[PDB]
Design a protein. Structure first.
Ligand SMILES: NC(=O)c1ccc[n+]([C@@H]2O[C@H](COP(=O)([O-])OP(=O)(O)OC[C@H]3O[C@@H](n4cnc5c(N)ncnc54)[C@H](OP(=O)(O)O)[C@@H]3O)[C@@H](O)[C@H]2O)c1
Ligand SMILES: NC(=O)c1ccc[n+]([C@@H]2O[C@H](COP(=O)([O-])OP(=O)(O)OC[C@H]3O[C@@H](n4cnc5c(N)ncnc54)[C@H](OP(=O)(O)O)[C@@H]3O)[C@@H](O)[C@H]2O)c1
Lengths: 488, 488, 488, 488
């Protein structure tokens, strides 16, 4: 028997919904990964219909004429109910609609909250009081941002947890659904070539990089109140840090993984102001179009803002595995490229017998783009030479695994929610540790409003970030030359 | 000032000379790697001339019309002197010819003994007594085979050492001049990713493979008296073992490397007859041409020979790094392919949390063909899967370094002799250890003449070799699927 | 300000109370380790008084005439209330007595349940419903045994947890209060000489020994229904195993320690019947008095009982640290001595250069008697000898720290409860893992009633236990000679 | 058959001979450790007899009336021959005397050179040319000092090696014959508890201490020309360093051990002047007798000497095991005590969970006095405390092994020479490395004559030595309290 499933989309008319969630569920249904008895219900304030949502979401489905019948079958199982985020009557209407659905009484209900943070409390309380299935499971999905600091996030987390259990709350960090971020676990705990060296005795520093080649691009008002830290460093880079630095779990069960992650998080001291390099991007007079403007050139950005669009932060995990190893979280918008990457710079080889011509090994795990794992290693120079040179042992997805289509992170995450897997989701205690690590720094920056180091649009950011990386132990040489091969 | 150099080729009319040595020295001169004042003198019994040697060696030089001037200059500095390997008068004639050479009195003399083993004693004693330069250095080059067993090789080694010092003797193992064999040292002692795991706590077994897709191909008389063991296992695979298993030298000086190599050799017990699988190839009735005949089908092979053309031998290095780790030396002619390869099968990862679907890591260093270093590692299955799958972190020379032309092993070895580097040459004590490891097994096989396990031409050899590998700890699964990529 | 404290002793007239608890609290008060405002209330069915309890407990206080005034001051703060374990009115009487106490409304209440397991449910429910302090904390103490198997213990643990939180429940394992058992943590995680070797790469096997030189000595009816396994192996040896095998906690906080302990417990498979050696002691006809009788010679033991008084069990912790290392739990009553001991037999040293006359290192942590940590190590034979001999690096408490009086385990445990430290107490999940490890074996033994291997009273137990230890990897040589020194 | 042996003592009338060598050979004969056919021949310039040598050496034999018959039997096989150290005729006389001995033609001859360094050349050349046995082996013994610097020692070492082989030369470093110095090898390579931690990843610094509670005590002329460095640091502390830092040999054969020792020596850079603290002791006015005078108060010491009687030197072994670990060689005369000691201060435990009250582990190997191995370790404070405290796991010879009489170093060394064991003797290349390590520093001090830091007689030496130790990484706390136990 196949259990009936319901996919309730809160704020179905929203930007995030029509841009990512509806295409995600359509792709999941298209490949037959959803349960056979799966229905999708849209819920928002706007008085739209199934046809209106269909027309709004078609340009993002990327459908083909060979999938027309699947398209109508998918949309024949779609529904929309208009209502309010605080009026209960709309929620009893939604419950009645779900019960009128085929075998909806025992159907598994799944709620996605694609709504602004201001309405999460009301939506969760109303769902818990009115829209809970009595037979099948009920799992709710909440979306970034998770509060603004330790106390603001803690209050919302406690209100949500007071209503739902930890096995019902699914906090989205869509980078946890990335292919390479999930491959991190297999890399670490399935291979003997990465086990004995994953410690402070061999790793000199850890660099977690997040780059965007574009700035806030017009809508700077939303980014002004958060900044680069709360936007990227607190969640994406920090969860990447947790996965890189975690101990081996007792099993691949979700609870063991999240226990290891929170154990690593609990061993990080609060961020010191002397380990932070903040930058705010200024326009490039040689820039092309959008590159000509800076952050202050956005009309929606209030005048005289000190919000940082670049950050370089050094963290330390005071445990027996990571004692003294700097964890450099370097993120920034309007940089020279787009890149999410894990870089492990290893220590110098002891007893160097190659006359200082060797350089530190670097295991690099590039999450995006061009998913690839390569380790920067010293090989003998090809040809009639004896000196070592920097090379790599490279595994590049998209060349080794061309026929395999790496799915979107949202697809995999929603499939995990359907399957009940909670390994790649944020637990409450992880959120508390993440916010308490960065809260003193955020409060100090807010109260002191320090001036960031301006960096030209499209550049690599402030040079003081490079100075900080050099000071804390990271070695940059610039002599590594890499060429994309051909005619294999 | 550039010192004058002389390249004396003993047995200049020989097969090895005209096939490899003269092209090697021509290539070295062509790229300007030899000293500017370098002359080459040919010496053999046949009454040939410089023109005759030129005509005989041209089809192997692979010269081009753009190099006619360089070829003429190279051959203008070539000379030939006919003589005998036991008559002194010919050797005083050669000495007078070398003195009549431009600044030959202080010229550095280098002797290559491209001669059968039966004349090494006479040639070396005559060279020491008559053909020694009094000002420049004198380095002699002796060639495989080095004796037949412990005592036969020991007598020749002691006789040669009684005439020349260890810094004057250059024992050729042309696999030590291979690109990847020399890259072994950089891989091991220049990278922190291969240091903590290069021990018995992580490596389950070591496999050293030598394969040829052809048999003795007509000239089986020479191979009958030696067999596959003395031909390949005693020198090539064993030196590969020494380089893989050695401790880190104090420096890249030759003496430290050879001390580490002999220290590793001294820790290997004698080969037990129960760890050896011997095979002799029989023709394939479905074979194509030369594949239709077996070893016994060669007319020059004496009737009823039990010589083995395949061998699988398990060795143990009883030291603190390699205690209990089997070193499987598996070599064989008339196999399914040509391949020289170092394979390190690592242990199972402790505390397997992936439900036994992970497999042992394998670091593979393929010496030939298609020089490449790759480590077989477990990555998360690309796509909508969570199970780990076997993959590789691959560095392939000829794709990453296509423009770089990897030189011949003889070129690099002769350049090392010219430069005085003795790291990649066989020391006397290394030869003694190599012969004492295998001598009891060879004597037992000779005195007992056991019947080898026949294997069809072009196959993988006897299946009892795979039984031995499975018994000693090596795990073969056959589920590793690899595809060569394209359009990078 | 010093908060008022109340020490409520349930079953104050009981054997355990008057033998251990009242002397323990008297010793704690005598040294001034209790809070200044501390009162002790006795509660049981018998209609006794403070004077009667005083007279009954004096022979176990070991008081001296120099402590008379402290004795009356201690007993002036003692009180007794008679009642029932199921009648509520007695519990309101106890609550009224506690409120009539000096500042008892806000006093911290501590309950010790020195009662048989049959009444824990009623006592705990009545305490929760009637005897809870509304201002100060309330911590309850429950005593061994914790159920009989997985389900019987689970029902009681769930019932108690339904009434009290994990920070209010204090499960007693008095071996966790032992000096050396607590020193285990400092030994493991405060010293760099015991960190890199505390893993499967160096430890061959782990032996946890519990010996008693006496049998059930008359009261065999209580031991018949439990046996040696439930009595000792399930709690004492298993908690010793957890402390030996645990990972390093994030901090010395109780929750981190108990998380590591339960993580280790979760990695142990269920006990296989082929790894168990069971013995039941038979009398020694050469025995002296009590030693002349066997277990079947006890009149209170039912005829034809197969209960085991000796056990040797091999356990395996399938994690990355302890994969494949046998954990031998060997316990038995009526053995040749009394001894609780942790023994870590290390692996043979790789690359043995001493011609096989070295032996495995053994780090021994003797909990009782004569508390001592010594590591069995190979030193050069003193005198004119070159061979290594077994010796030890010994630290013996009572010789190095003779002036320091090592306190009783109950004293330290009750002081920890007073201070709110819960590191050395059994958590609910630890109990679940402990019972699920041994439940199938206990059920199989009960349903199959196998005949144990008889062993003479005062002997070392069945020899099949030593066969099992030899089979699983433990090496016993018997050549270790030790002499107690003198005149330092 | 027992081969005849001859013990030739050059300079038999000398101080070293009559104080140490004759008692040593008497003790060796008394216990029956010498070969049965062993004779001793004395050789010096003075015209003495066997009776005169007997009377001169009796006060140092420590004989007893129960050993009279053994004493006459020992002296009945003693002989004396007077001669010259350069006249050959005396050496032919000695040879004729040795041949007139019972079966002296094939007797094994052993020469001890208890002579000043000025006559070693003549004595060795004369012994090689005249006093070499043609049947039995001939082993010569040379004594400290071995030259004054690199070139002065190298000339003598090359001259001796030109006459005798390395298996015939026995260079005495009597600290290599000490009990604990020889126990170092068993400690390191027979125990798994000292193997994984004997590296730079766990050891913070190495301290080698040599202390004497007395100064030059009158005969300062001999010490003036050498100083504390050449006297102690170059040989005793440096050989202790070699044994501590060596790699595991392939076997217990002498050649493998000496190869490892020279390999370690070759990895030390020359001593920098900024890592040296030099002191010269000044008298203590509150002094006792000899303690009232300083080094300058010795009449035989030339006025205005800058010779150092204390030294603290930091060395570095740049290899893969000891990269960056300081090796502190701290020696000094007229200090507060006598002590030769190996101290290994380990690194701080990573991820300290004990709030910084733990301290670095120290493995201490006290060579003299009161031979003992103990490791300073952190144990839980005995009693009602939870904080860790410094303790030790102690093995003290003389308490564990009272009945065993630890022999003199000279006894064991001479027994090794008789048995042909050369493990505990200085090879030529070891001497070259030892002298090249310290030669630039010695030459700089000699040419610059810097003023040492005066320290009062009987003190701990200059405080700048403690500043240097603190600067290079060594941590001194002074909170370690140790008490000698009693009534075991
Ligand atoms: N790229 C992304 O957009 C992105 C990425 C990651 C996370 N998220 C998170 O996903 C959630 C979805 O937001 P969004 O990106 O879709 O922004 P949005 O388009 O502004 O919000 C989507 C829906 O929220 C409702 N809404 C808007 N303003 C509201 C208000 N003041 N009070 C109550 N409801 C309101 C609207 O419902 P009606 O149409 O019914 O009025 C709207 O359709 C956000 O919390 C966002 O932080 C978004
Ligand atoms: N692929 C290879 O050929 C190869 C590979 C590795 C090592 N080697 C070694 O290199 C050496 C060169 O031998 P090769 O391969 O050139 O074989 P080869 O052609 O038979 O021998 C070369 C020369 O040796 C001389 N020679 C032959 N038989 C002789 C005899 N009975 N007495 C004295 N001299 C004799 C001849 O000199 P004249 O012409 O002046 O009579 C001949 O020109 C051999 O020892 C071989 O083991 C060869």
């Amino acid at each position: 028997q196949s259990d009936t499933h319901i996919f309730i989309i809160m704020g179905a008319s929203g930007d995030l919904a029509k841009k990512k969630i509806y295409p995600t569920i359509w792709w999941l249904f298209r490949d037959g990964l959803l349960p056979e008895n799966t229905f999708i219900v849209g819920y928002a304030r706007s008085r739209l219909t199934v046809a209106d949502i269909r027309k709004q979401s078609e340009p993002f489905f990327k459908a083909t004429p060979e999938e027309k019948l699947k398209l109508e079958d998918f949309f024949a199982r779609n529904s929309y109910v208009a209502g309010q985020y605080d009026d209960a009557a709309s929620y009893q209407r939604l419950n009645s609609h779900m019960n009128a659905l085929h075998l909806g009484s025992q159907a598994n209900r799944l709620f996605y909250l694609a709504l602004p943070p201001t309405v999460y409390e009301a939506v969760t309380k109303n769902i818990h009081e009115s829209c809970m299935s009595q037979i099948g499971w009920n799992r709710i999905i909440v979306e970034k941002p998770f509060g603004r600091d330790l106390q603001s996030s803690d209050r919302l987390s406690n209100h949500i947890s007071s209503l739902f259990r930890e096995d019902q709350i699914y906090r989205i960090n869509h980078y946890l659904g990335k292919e390479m971020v999930q491959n991190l676990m297999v890399l670490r705990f399935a291979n003997r070539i990465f086990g004995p060296i994953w410690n402070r005795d061999n790793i000199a520093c850890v660099i977690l990089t997040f780059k965007e080649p574009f700035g806030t691009e017009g809508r700077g008002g939303y980014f002004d109140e958060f900044g680069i830290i709360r936007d990227v460093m607190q969640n994406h880079l920090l969860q990447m840090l947790c996965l890189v630095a975690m101990e081996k779990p007792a099993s691949t069960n979700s609870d063991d993984v999240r226990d290891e992650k929170v154990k690593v998080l609990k061993c990080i001291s609060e961020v010191q102001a002397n380990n932070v390099v903040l930058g705010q991007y200024v326009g490039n007079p040689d820039g092309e179009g959008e590159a000509t403007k800076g952050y202050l050139d956005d009309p929606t950005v209030p005048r005289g803002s000190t919000t940082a669009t670049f950050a370089a932060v050094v963290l330390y995990v005071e445990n027996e595995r990571w004692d003294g190893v700097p964890f450099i979280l370097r993120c920034g918008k309007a940089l020279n490229e787009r890149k999410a990457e894990v870089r492990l710079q290893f220590h110098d080889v002891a007893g160097d017998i190659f006359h200082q011509q060797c350089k530190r090994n670097e295991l690099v795990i590039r999450v995006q783009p061009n998913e690839a794992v390569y380790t920067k290693m010293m090989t003998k120079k090809p040809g009639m030479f004896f000196n070592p040179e920097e090379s790599e042992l490279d595994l590049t997805y998209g060349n080794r695994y061309k026929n395999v289509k790496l799915p979107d992170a949202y697809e995999r995450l929603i499939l995990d929610v359907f399957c009940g897997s909670q390994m790649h989701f944020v637990r409450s205690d992880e959120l508390r540790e993440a916010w308490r690590i960065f809260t003193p720094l955020l409060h100090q920056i807010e109260l002191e409003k320090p001036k960031p180091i301006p960096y030209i649009y499209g550049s690599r950011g402030p040079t003081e970030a490079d100075e900080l990386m050099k000071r804390v132990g990271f070695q940059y040489e610039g002599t590594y030359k890499w060429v994309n091969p051909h005619k294999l």
